[PDB]
Design a protein around this ligand. Sequence first.
Ligand code: CLA
Ligand code: CLA
Ligand code: CLA
Ligand code: CLA
Ligand code: CLA
Ligand code: CLA
Ligand SMILES: CC1=C(/C=C/C(C)=C/C=C/C(C)=C/C=C/C=C(C)/C=C/C=C(C)/C=C/C2=C(C)CCCC2(C)C)C(C)(C)CCC1
Ligand code: SF4
Ligand code: SF4
Ligand code: SF4
Lengths: 165, 41, 731, 35, 80, 143, 31, 74, 74
Amino acid sequence: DVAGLTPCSESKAFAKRKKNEVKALNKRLKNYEADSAPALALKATIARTEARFDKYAKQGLLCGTDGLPHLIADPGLALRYGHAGDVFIPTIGFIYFAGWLGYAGSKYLQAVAATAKPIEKEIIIDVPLAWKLLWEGFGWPLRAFAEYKNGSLMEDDAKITVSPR
Amino acid sequence: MKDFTTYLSTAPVLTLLSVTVVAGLLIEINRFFPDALIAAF
Amino acid sequence: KLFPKFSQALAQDPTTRRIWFGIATAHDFESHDGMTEERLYQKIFASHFGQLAIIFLWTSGNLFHVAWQGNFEQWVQDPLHIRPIAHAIWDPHFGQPAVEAFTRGGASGPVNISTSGVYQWWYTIGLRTNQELYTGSIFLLVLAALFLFAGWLHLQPAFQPALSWFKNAESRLNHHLAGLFGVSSLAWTGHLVHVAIPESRGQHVGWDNFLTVLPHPAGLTPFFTGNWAAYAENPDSASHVFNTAQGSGTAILTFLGGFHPQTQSLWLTDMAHHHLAIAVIFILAGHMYRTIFGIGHSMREILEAQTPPSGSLGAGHKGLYDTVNNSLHFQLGLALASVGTISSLVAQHMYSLPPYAFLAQDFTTQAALYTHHQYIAGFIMCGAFAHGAIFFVRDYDPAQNRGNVLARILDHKEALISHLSWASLFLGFHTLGLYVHNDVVQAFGTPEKQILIEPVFAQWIQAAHGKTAYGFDFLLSSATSAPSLAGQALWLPGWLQGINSDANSLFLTIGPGDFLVHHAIALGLHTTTLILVKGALDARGSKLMPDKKDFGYSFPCDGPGRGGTCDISAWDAFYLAVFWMLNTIGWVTFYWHWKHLGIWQGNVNQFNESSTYLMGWLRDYLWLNSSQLINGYNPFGMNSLSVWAWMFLFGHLIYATGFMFLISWRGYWQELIETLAWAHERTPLANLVRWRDKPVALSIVQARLVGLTHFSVGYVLTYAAFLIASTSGKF
Amino acid sequence: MSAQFLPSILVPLVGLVFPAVAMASMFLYIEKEEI
Amino acid sequence: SHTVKIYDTCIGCTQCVRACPTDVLEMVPWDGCKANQIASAPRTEDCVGCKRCESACPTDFLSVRVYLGSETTRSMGLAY
Amino acid sequence: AFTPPTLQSDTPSPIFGGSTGGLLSQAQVEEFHVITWESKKEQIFEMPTGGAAIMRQGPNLLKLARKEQCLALLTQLRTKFKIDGYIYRVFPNGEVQYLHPKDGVYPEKVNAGRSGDNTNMRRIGQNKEPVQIKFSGKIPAEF
Amino acid sequence: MPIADYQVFTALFLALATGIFAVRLGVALYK
Amino acid sequence: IWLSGMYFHGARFSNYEAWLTDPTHIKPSAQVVWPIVGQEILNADVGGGFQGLQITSGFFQLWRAAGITSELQL
Amino acid sequence: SIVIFHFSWKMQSDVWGTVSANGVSHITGGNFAQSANTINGWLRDFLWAQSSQVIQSYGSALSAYGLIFLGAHF
Ligand code: CLA
Ligand code: CLA
Ligand code: CLA
Ligand code: CLA
Ligand code: CLA
Ligand code: CLA
Ligand SMILES: CC1=C(/C=C/C(C)=C/C=C/C(C)=C/C=C/C=C(C)/C=C/C=C(C)/C=C/C2=C(C)CCCC2(C)C)C(C)(C)CCC1
Ligand code: SF4
Ligand code: SF4
Ligand code: SF4
């Protein structure tokens, strides 16, 4: 409980939702020989649904007045309640992968800018160079913080063109 | 060959290839690790 | 060919344009021929007098129609079982069934049922009979005549005030803060205490006997002896019946907080005390600036000293006094921004803290008032930004405003525009993505895979106000905290009682659906601000058009050169932002209406579960609630909701028409009209009639204006019809 | 209500007589050529 | 009755005067450029506003500059 | 010096079958235009009002409504036929102006003896500020 | 007690007077 | 290529042979979806002991009019 | 679009249906003849009414048609 939200493993509405959705799939089953391809597909679907509902209850997600899992988007109020996997950990994971792709693209631009025909190396990518830079982009937190502490990441506005006010 | 590989490096083909690779990867991850709502480690 | 008396350039126009543009430029006095600053200010002053006359006549007409054709006397007796009548209907196209269907609130003939909430207001402020309404109407009619006479009086060279009188800002602020605001609310407190409070306790106080009635049994001695607490001795009991004397009390300046149990509105003594405090504060604030008595402030010196050292702001606010004072569009933009934000404030408070008796009890009035003031605020905000753009194009002097915050904010405009772009892109991408994800996983029959973020920050703030529902137990929700111990004897009993009850709109419970909708609102505000701010800053010139200020605020384009420059002017930025303002206010009103429609039926679950995906909005809101509206007239007859069904289709038609002007552009129409001109000059029996004005297709900017006006009118009419017919039908 | 006849006279005045007269006067004035 | 101006950044390339469809721009002798010629707009009563002149100027920023203004029968391009 | 030629009214017109794009009521109240050229062979050309006409040997005259139609026709002649023509402006009272080849020399070639009207000797941003010229019945680019 | 006819007529006459004041102010503004 | 795809899907992922026997109650289908993200629900209970999307291209009626009556011929 | 709307309503109202051994019971019941005369008739008796099967398609095999219907609106 973090804000009037009982753990889904306790909420009765969550188990009721599990029950109802499984009962619907059972009603769909009761029409085929339990060895035909449709019957096997339905049985696999029911197994998948049961696995999902047990997995959600195991991880202690919070269910509301209705039986639906809720997430917490405040560090500290999710780290002292064991719910950091809801937003904070995926926040780190995204920020990392997004930065990886962005840094790989940025370094590819800065690498093909200093060539003979920079406008040509954007529509006909150099795949070995792109792949090398894609591999080097994994350390992007380190390299980006190095360039910020170095001052080489950014450009002074006296050199960027601007509009006539 | 060299020109064929140059064609395979063009933005229309390489973009489509990379989107296909990433899509296939996400599809595989969701096929083996489905219904993952949180980063449970 | 001399109609545009103010514009010689348009007078010589041989086409129909001279009429169109001759109307749309009638109030832009600064662009008129032979115009001086003195004359501009005098003409503006007289126009303001005309505006106040219009406002007083409109309110007098409302009062007269309610007194004459309304059922106010009947509504006073049974405020909850009577439908307030607006005005009578006299239409010679009505069939008999329509006359049958529009005879409603007991009136002898067809009538309109009022959704403006003026009945509740006049009932709350002390008006009980129709003779009082008629007296108010007559007094306001005379007052409008007096303001008209003053407006004519000050247009006269014997009475015309000099230009230096208008620019006197210190005296004007002194008199508006202390006199227009302070004394006016002081007199409102006087009315409340002398009339509205006693009329709320069964006693009748009128012009006949107000000098023979003590508002307090020990009148005026506690006030002058400092024993002020004697004016809050016995307040209104929790079993008080409004308009009657069942447990009335003698206190006139109470501070109970919360709501009246029966009316579900604010206590009237609370509002009297409110206005007393406001009066004192505003008079004190009105004694701040220097006039002719050798004390006070020179605002110029204040602005000249607000320059931080280290030069973070540059020259600080050096030259802002003259900048604001000399430019009328700067002042107009500031006033519009303030008035629009206050209109939004009025809308957001008056539903959660209803101030009028038996308001909130009536549901269509709540929705109507909220949506009205929200749309008004949205339009006013667009106007504030439009006039900021006009200030930059017209009245901005780089030499005077050199190094001050205005120049500094023009200096780095790309940072502002790029960061607005990032914020809007983020909000749009993510709110749309979450809505689509919820919608897809619901579509596949697995609603438990929904991303339902909890609004823990807003829930935490709600808990800080004493809402003991999320278990935060933070500030006012902790009966032991310092703010709780401080207010537990003044205001906190009633306030906590109101906030912790689900019978009102005071701080509604919020879940994931509220999170998603608030982020949609954030997307709307940020994108509208992006368009408006970009068009205001990118108005003196772009990289594409470095000399844009040489062309003015409004112009079509810059030809098809340099790739094409359609919609390049700042006026076109205002044009494009009006659409986003409409969309954002539509989201806000949709959210409010569905939340409260779930609230009023007791079925909070419908919203709380169906609002996390977009098909829930399309099906459980628009489609479900439109059943009674579209059934207003049908092959089996019609009911009172036929007018709203017709208005529904009417707004649809207007909006669809506006697309014609928005999509098709001047060039197909010119050739088409010109073929028509060949047809007319060239057909027998019609050559005897010729046009005095050469018929030409609407101009580019004019057509954009026409399409935008149709779009806005259709939007407003359609939503108003849906709202009124969907709330009044069910309640 | 009182003066039941009064709307039946005022409504045609404001929705037919006044609009036609105002439009005629306005169209005469915008084409007055010399004001 | 559009206001057409020519500024000294002109290089006298004759593009603006071949572009114009109504013969408003013209070549006159000058000395502030290598071609020893500049454009001029004497017949500006004929300017329609098409800005073909302004779309052909190679100078940055543009040397021939049109400011649409008052509208007449010639400026509005009316054949009826 | 140069002397503009005189409009000879008795000139053969191109063989044309009649069009719905010809003159209108504007040519009887305001003014219209006339274009004259000299054809080295009788040949088919495209009249700017739709359709095709045949220009005859020698002098040809053709009257249109707008000046721009006449110049479009003349540009067609100069490109696809290498024929040089003259554009006169006819008023309905009888007055005749002479328009396009104003100095006998075409507008793209320097004539030395032309008027440099509307030629500012400042750049584009060197114009005055609108706040300085407020309430003046002009625009910043004519000071 | 509904308002009487003479009250309606007095109101309408005073409205006419106010309209006269309005037209005076309007023509003053047009000048 | 498009026609080959249509006939191949009719031959492999369609209930054509089941639909021939009872054309009045079996709903024509010729496209099945995978299990990958709960999209299995899209497999309709069309009939013939089959699960798939319900086609509306009129290919079954066309093939019957041609006179097919086998999934080898497709 | 107007042509296909006309075809859909006319066929669902005056042709398509089931025979109940005593008369044809059409899908919509014949409301085209009396309700198509007005714009509100099209908005209510054809477009609001017949959209009930698409907005209530979540969790079924037609759920995809419920998504595209929304998605196309985007
Ligand atoms: C690697 C290329 C790259 C990089 C490093 C950036 C970086 C940035 N962009 Mg940008 N952008 C890009 C490509 C890139 N962009 C492209 C191709 C487009 C056209 C669609 C845009 C359109 C765009 C807009 C409209 C905006 C930005 C903005 C921004 C800034 C905010 C961060 C952000 O979330 O942007 C958002 C990113 C996107 C909207 C799309 C990203 C495009 C893909 C995902 C990346 C391309 C990778 C490349 C194709 C692969 C090369 C790898 C190599 C091995 C070959 C940031 C500095 C915002 C800003 O103004 O700054 C505050 C802003 O509003 N970008
Ligand atoms: C400006 C609004 C206003 C007006 C016009 C009046 C007028 C009146 N009040 Mg009242 N009153 C008001 C506000 C007002 N009051 C407020 C805000 C409160 C408290 C919430 C009260 C509470 C009150 C009580 C309890 C009583 C009255 C009474 C009276 C009547 C007797 C006159 C009097 O008070 O003795 C004369 C006043 C003085 C000798 C000194 C007053 C001078 C003050 C302190 C300064 C004036 C400056 C002021 C800002 C000017 C504003 C201009 C404005 C009036 C246009 C009188 C008709 C008494 C009565 O007999 O009931 C009929 C009575 O007992 N009033
Ligand atoms: C205190 C409020 C206020 C004031 C005093 C002004 C004053 C002024 N504005 Mg302004 N403005 C405001 C608010 C205000 N505005 C707001 C809220 C907006 C946002 C919409 C705008 C947006 C705006 C723009 C874009 C422009 C001005 C302009 C001007 C100047 C000339 C006005 C004009 O051209 O008249 C002409 C008046 C009209 C043409 C009226 C048009 C008809 C309306 C818009 C719609 C009519 C449809 C009708 C309601 C439908 C009937 C309903 C029924 C059928 C159901 C003038 C000084 C112009 C300017 O400064 O020039 C540079 C300019 O271009 N304003
Ligand atoms: C449903 C209609 C619609 C939509 C979706 C948008 C969306 C957007 N508008 Mg827009 N607008 C609209 C109507 C709409 N507008 C109308 C009618 C007008 C009046 C002309 C305007 C006028 C307007 C202006 C003036 C501006 C915008 C801006 C923006 C962008 C704001 C940033 C954002 O929210 O990021 C969120 C991004 C999205 C919501 C796009 C969705 C992402 C797609 C769907 C993902 C791609 C999936 C897939 C690969 C698609 C390709 C598949 C296909 C090729 C097979 C955004 C993309 C502002 C802007 O440019 O941003 C900086 C801007 O200033 N709008
Ligand atoms: C609902 C929106 C709407 C409406 C009403 C129209 C209407 C019209 N369009 Mg248009 N169009 C639209 C959307 C719309 N369009 C959009 C979105 C586009 C972008 C693609 C276009 C693009 C377009 C083009 C390219 C053309 C038209 C043309 C026309 C005209 C054809 C003549 C006609 O239809 O007969 C009659 C008109 C009507 C039936 C309109 C309704 C009027 C009512 C039924 C009767 C009028 C009496 C009235 C109620 C009484 C007066 C009341 C009093 C207070 C004044 C017509 C006025 C064509 C045209 O100009 O003429 C051929 C033309 O070529 N439109
Ligand atoms: C400005 C507010 C206002 C509004 C919106 C209306 C609206 C209406 N009135 Mg009403 N009226 C008003 C003020 C107003 N009135 C006032 C202050 C009085 C007191 C004298 C009256 C007395 C009155 C009577 C006796 C009647 C109406 C009636 C009507 C209805 C039919 C209109 C008509 O033909 O009557 C004509 C209206 C008049 C002859 C006088 C109204 C003059 C107002 C003040 C015009 C103000 C102009 C406005 C502010 C600016 C708009 C610009 C415009 C000039 C182009 C209509 C709904 C009739 C009705 O009941 O229909 C069933 C009816 O018989 N009114
Ligand atoms: C464009 C332009 C313009 C215009 C602008 C605008 C329009 C602006 C605005 C804006 C706006 C419209 C804003 C708003 C605002 C507000 C704010 C910003 C606020 C606030 C507040 C606070 C901070 C609060 C606090 C508190 C709380 C928290 C609660 C309780 C109470 C208290 C008080 C404590 C101008 C001409 C001028 C200039 C130039 C150009
Ligand atoms: S299409 Fe219209 S707005 Fe765009 S450049 Fe051409 S004339 Fe200007
Ligand atoms: S196109 Fe520009 S640079 Fe060239 S002659 Fe004309 S004005 Fe001068
Ligand atoms: S705008 Fe057109 S008509 Fe005017 S000068 Fe330029 S090219 Fe000539």
